[PDB]
């Protein structure tokens, strides 16, 4: 349930249902921690109170 900063998208792929999945390089870690994440896991965050 926590959110981690994405440093780089290293690879993409389409599943059987035609939706995209991205191989995520997580900031602060190396290539061993890369994970394929569904498209909707990528979030843009802005300040909530301004």
């Amino acid at each position: 349930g926590d959110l981690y900063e994405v440093e780089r998208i290293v690879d993409k792929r389409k599943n059987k249902k035609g939706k995209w999945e991205y191989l995520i390089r997580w900031k602060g870690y190396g290539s061993t921690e890369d994970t394929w994440e569904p498209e909707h896991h990528l979030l843009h965050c802005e300040e909530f109170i301004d």
């Binding site: 994440e37 979030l43 965050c45």
Partner: peptide, 6 residues
């Protein structure tokens, strides 16, 4: 950006 790690 950020992403869920699931």
């Amino acid at each position: 950006x950020f992403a869920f790690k699931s």
